[PDB]
Design a protein around this nucleic acid. Structure first.
Lengths: 83, 80, 82, 83
DNA sequence: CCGAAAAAAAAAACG
DNA sequence: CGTTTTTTTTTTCGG
């Protein structure tokens, strides 16, 4: 039936995507293992990745607000030029 | 603290790319579930179905692992 | 602040006693495994057996939970035709 | 055989102990939940409990070193009670 | 936001 | 010692 087929496609797509996600997580562990093999401190590395992630989030908030300012300026410009 | 730092950069950049890909996957999963809800499905029940199937596969590999432990223990006893 | 201080110490003290008890339990578990090891058992295999049995109990609990979801969803569909 | 019975008592004792352990973890979680219900921040509470645990480890190590000093002094005292 | 469920990070046991 | 699981903290995600 159509509902059985929809169910099957849902479970199938989710399970494939989660396979891919597990592959990504495993590759990340590969990078950390190689970093450790070259003498790096994995724990501080993970802390660095977390900190850079947090700073990146702040920058994106700043960029969205920045775009608000740019939008208001854009309206002021179009109004200035015509009339 | 010189020529290791160039490698450090490759490390962090590779990690950041991989986590980008990971977030893209998570987003696709969320999209599939939201479309399922839009087609009248209960996302919570769907996730429980996926969860149980995942646990069953994990158990099956676990039992393969205990089997391998048994065969190894026997071989260790018989070799020495 | 002030009045909360009496509650704070009672909380931390009860939790810390409970953590004492939990650590004592972990010690007893290690004792059982060590004595079995002294009797020739393979501790790793034993832990795997305990772990598999626990996974079976978890799986059965999950099956009961999804069963309840099915029953509730059926009740939802039927009770909201009227 | 006797090894079958030993196996069974082992598995049952461990499983009984892990039952007890899960009940204790539940009591801890409940205490934190009611504390939160009284307006506390659970995360900071857990951080404090962890810090006190770390202090307890530090003091017990230092107390063991203290015992080394006390024992050596005791040896000097037994030597003294001879002169 | 909450409460459960996944994942990351931290801690510890085993050889 | 270190590694390779276990335990805890942090994060996710639907409601």
């Amino acid at each position: 039936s159509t509902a059985q087929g929809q169910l099957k496609s849902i479970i199938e797509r989710v399970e494939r995507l989660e396979v891919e996600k597990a592959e990504i997580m495993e590759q990340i562990k590969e990078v950390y293992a190689e970093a450790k093999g070259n003498g790096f401190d994995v724990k501080v590395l993970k802390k660095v990745v977390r900190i850079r992630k947090q700073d990146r989030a702040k920058r994106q908030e700043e960029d969205a607000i920045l775009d608000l300012y740019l939008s208001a300026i854009g309206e002021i410009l179009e109004h200035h030029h015509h009339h």
